[PDB]
Curated annotation (Swiss-Prot), chain A:
Protein name as annotated: Glutamate receptor 2
Gene designation: Gria2
Source species of the chain: Rattus norvegicus (Rat)
Inducing factors: Down-regulated in the pyramidal cell layer of CA1 in the hippocampus by global ischemia.
Lipid moiety-binding region (S-palmitoyl cysteine): C76
Intramembrane spans: 58-73, 74-76
Complexes and interactors: Homotetramer or heterotetramer of pore-forming glutamate receptor subunits. Tetramers may be formed by the dimerization of dimers. May interact with MPP4. Forms a ternary complex with GRIP1 and CSPG4. Interacts with ATAD1 in an ATP-dependent manner. ATAD1-catalyzed ATP hydrolysis disrupts binding to ATAD1 and to GRIP1 and leads to AMPAR complex disassembly. Interacts with GRIP2. Interacts with GRIP1. Interacts with NSF via its C-terminus. Interacts with CACNG2, PICK1 and GRIP2. Interacts with GRIA1 and SYNDIG1. Part of a complex containing GRIA2, NSF and NAPA and/or NAPB.
Segments in the Cytoplasmic topological domain: 77-82
PTM comment text: Palmitoylated. Depalmitoylated upon L-glutamate stimulation. Cys-76 palmitoylation leads to Golgi retention and decreased cell surface expression. Ubiquitinated by RNF167, leading to its degradation.
Domain notes: The M4 transmembrane segment mediates tetramerization and is required for cell surface expression.
Residues binding L-glutamate, per UniProt: S141, T142, E192
Crucial to convey clamshell closure to channel opening (site feature) positions: I120
Protein family according to the UniProt entry: Belongs to the glutamate-gated ion channel (TC 1.A.10.1) family. GRIA2 subfamily.
Note: The postsynaptic actions of L-glutamate are mediated by a variety of receptors that are named according to their selective agonists. This receptor binds AMPA (quisqualate) > L-glutamate > kainate.
Curated annotation (Swiss-Prot), chains C, G:
Coiled coil: none
Lineage per the UniProt record: Eukaryota, Metazoa, Chordata, Craniata, Vertebrata
TM regions (residue ranges): 5-25, 75-95, 105-125, 144-164
Tissues showing expression: Brain.
Gene Ontology terms: cellular component: AMPA glutamate receptor complex; cell surface; cerebellar mossy fiber; glutamatergic synapse; hippocampal mossy fiber to CA3 synapse; postsynaptic density membrane; Schaffer collateral - CA1 synapse; somatodendritic compartment
GO terms for biological process, alphabetical: eye blink reflex; membrane depolarization; membrane hyperpolarization; nervous system process; neuromuscular junction development; neurotransmitter receptor localization to postsynaptic specialization membrane; positive regulation of protein localization to basolateral plasma membrane; postsynaptic neurotransmitter receptor diffusion trapping
Organism of derivation: Mus musculus
Protein name according to UniProt: Voltage-dependent calcium channel gamma-2 subunit
Gene that produces this protein: Cacng2
Assembly and oligomerization: The L-type calcium channel is composed of five subunits: alpha-1, alpha-2/delta, beta and gamma. Interacts with the PDZ domains of DLG4/PSD-95 and DLG1/SAP97. May interact with GOPC. Acts as an auxiliary subunit for AMPA-selective glutamate receptors (AMPARs). Found in a complex with GRIA1, GRIA2, GRIA3, GRIA4, CNIH2, CNIH3, CACNG3, CACNG4, CACNG5, CACNG7 and CACNG8. Interacts with GRIA1 and GRIA2. Interacts with MPP2.
Residues of the full protein shown: 6 to 208 of 323
Localisation per UniProt entry: Membrane; Synapse, Synaptosome
Disease: Defects in Cacng2 cause the stargazer (stg) phenotype. Stg mice have spike-wave seizures characteristic of absence epilepsy, with accompanying defects in the cerebellum and inner ear.
Family statement drawn from the similarity comment of this UniProt entry: Belongs to the PMP-22/EMP/MP20 family. CACNG subfamily.
């Protein structure tokens, strides 16, 4: 039987840190600066005198510890007392509330798109797909078959083979295989199934 | 039949089914382990401080 | 009272035995293969064949950035280090029959037991990751490792608690 | 002076369990190594949860039954599904 | 009709998503920084109120 | 706590999927779909010269 | 204990030097480009071409509702503001050698450093938001700016710590 032949689709090896891919480098960088600045400002405003600085626990280290609890949404042991500190807290809370949601949404979308790939199956839709090209051997019986058969799908196949250039034809099986191997994904070839079964 | 030399195909169980592989989130565990490993040294230097007060 | 010393030493001994057995047995994985397809069982070092004419045949495993991660699986360094450090910890508390009045033995052995335990999690993660690089089902050695890890995590808490109690009594 | 703090082993297990679930845990490490240990654990749980919810959301969006078998080799490995040709059919003689 | 080429009308090839740009969320950062800027001023006006 | 963690996640996921399915409603257009669509049906007046033309 | 003056006096000058150098160098970005494409380096103000026969050729940058945002990128006022405020902050501690017992010349030092840092942050965000609209990567100046911001923060923190300490001991 005549057969179609294609390259293997390359296996999607995971990365060691692939989990970051939804969110892009620059955001990951800028979070650090926002964290540092927020913590420093919270400290400074907390420990300027209330009129006496012994009246609150918000030392530098405690100020760094509060903010990290807030970003990962795991609550905290202590809460800022003054109005200004409460303002700072509310702002940081809104920021994290936006970021975490965006991250989750994007990851879900990224996985979702992957499911409906629907790869080429039965190969008959090469009469309907056009992004992927396919070749045939010169002077082969196949070259006669598509002129000489007249079934509608093979008619449009032969029309494609007529019109497409650089041409579908090739002089040798060896260099046709070389073409398929180099032209990965975008190119295909027609051959006798016995020969494919030998090669593959 | 002697000349065929590639036959690796998913059998018994299948990679493609649905679930996230361990590899897909592998990275996180290394960060965790390193985090836990670091905190020991902090306590050790805290010991080395107080032990000659 | 007191006899918790016996319990902790027994626990350390048993963990050491389980760990060395696990490292020394070809019972990590069942899979299809051939000892150059048939059901095949694997240790970390070697591939050995059952369920056929070659039953009892063995061969050395095929060991062959992630370019550098390759050697990490091949060396299996974390198992070995875990065993060595558990040995260190066990032998330390065994010395506590003498050289007393210093109590550093117990704390040091505790840290050894804890670090030994952490090592095995890395080993498991490494192994499970590398083998993905089907139909598989785990052999008994994997569970001997898990049990060793659990017992190591148990014993160290009791040893640290013993150190604390035997030291705190200086407060009264 | 030892045991001047809540973090016995039982309470430590309790805290780490509540921390995984994103629930109110009252006690605080108050101390550097403990805070260090606390941080990474929150990061881990955040990532795990987000992954789970995303993947389940994707899973419910598109469905695919998966055929149980495809090949004559599978029919040689048959579990229970019996099979046969037409009777009196020349395919039977061919077999 | 024999010269029909553009089957891309039917989305004959499928795009793939990419990560969010900084632009896609940049707005929130401005809000945060403005909030901090305001937050500093209150403390000074409070201290001047309690200056007598 | 475990019960809560399962339920709330499932709810969020389902709501997202529900809203997502609606977006690809893609209603019939340009009479081109009637080349392939067969869940719909269509027809004409009888004796109209539309029938002769077709 | 007293000595903290010796440390906080250090970093501000360094941060100033780093930031002004970063403003003064044509190496924030590697990209394709032109100097009337080829691989290219740029600063805030101008572009110069390399990796070809024209290597060393230069031109002033292309300066060209949200429309009014463009002015912010075109001016790059925020770096300049941060530099001037940091200068003022350093002059605060330079002043506080005289007029002692006031204690209040120090106070404003931290405020200047904080505000300069916030400006630097905004400047970076604006620059990225503008330019990202090609296998690019960042030149050393960018990291110089980041480090400058970090050290300005640290110096501000320790200066506020000094004003906390030195004044409190008068208050009993
Ligand atoms: N058509 C076949 C009968 C069906 C079969 O062989 O299974 C024949 O001519 O004998």
């Amino acid at each position: 039987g005549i057969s179609i032949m294609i390259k293997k689709p390359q296996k999607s090896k995971p990365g060691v840190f692939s989990f970051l891919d939804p969110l892009a480098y620059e955001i990951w960088m800028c979070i650090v600066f926002a964290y540092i600045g927020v913590s420093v400002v919270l400290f400074l405003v907390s420990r300027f005198s209330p009129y006496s600085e012994s009246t609150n626990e918000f030392g530098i280290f405690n100020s760094l510890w509060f903010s990290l609890g807030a970003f990962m949404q795991q609550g905290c042991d202590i809460s800022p007392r003054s109005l200004s500190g409460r303002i700072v807290g509310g702002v940081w809370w809104f920021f994290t509330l936006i970021i975490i949601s965006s991250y989750t949404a994007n990851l879900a979308a990224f996985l979702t798109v992957e499911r409906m790939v629907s790869p080429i199956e039965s190969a008959e839709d090469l009469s309907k797909q056009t992004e992927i090209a396919y070749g045939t051997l010169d002077s082969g019986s196949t070259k006669e078959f598509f002129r000489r058969s007249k079934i509608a799908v093979f008619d449009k196949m032969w029309t494609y083979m007529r019109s497409a250039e650089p041409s579908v034809f090739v002089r040798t099986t060896a260099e046709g295989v070389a073409r398929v191997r180099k032209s990965k994904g975008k190119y295909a070839y027609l051959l006798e199934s016995t020969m494919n079964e030998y090669i593959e | 039949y002697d000349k065929g030399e590639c036959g690796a195909k998913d059998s018994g169980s299948k990679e493609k089914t649905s679930a996230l592989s361990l590899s897909n989130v592998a990275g996180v565990f290394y960060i965790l382990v390193g985090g836990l490993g670091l905190a020991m040294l902090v306590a050790l230097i805290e010991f080395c401080y107080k032990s000659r007060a | 009272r007191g006899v918790q010393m016996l319990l902790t030493t027994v626990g350390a001994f048993a963990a050491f035995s389980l760990m060395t057995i696990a490292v020394g047995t070809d019972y990590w994985l069942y899979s299809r293969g051939v000892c150059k397809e048939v059901m095949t069982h694997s240790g970390l070092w070697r591939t050995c064949c059952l369920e056929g004419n070659f039953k009892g045949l063995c061969k050395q495993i095929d060991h062959f950035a992630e370019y550098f991660l390759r050697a990490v699986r091949a060396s299996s360094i974390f198992p070995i280090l875990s065993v060595i450090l558990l040995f260190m910890g066990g032998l330390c508390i065994a010395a506590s029959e003498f050289y007393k009045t210093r109590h550093n033995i117990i704390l040091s052995a505790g840290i050894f037991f804890v670090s030994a335990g952490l090592s095995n999690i890395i080993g498991i993660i490494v192994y499970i990751s590398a083998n993905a690089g089907n139909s598989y089902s785990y052999g008994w050695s994997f569970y001997f490792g898990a049990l060793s890890f659990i017992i190591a995590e148990m014993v160290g808490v009791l040893a640290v608690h013993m150190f604390i109690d035997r030291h705190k009594q200086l407060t009264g």
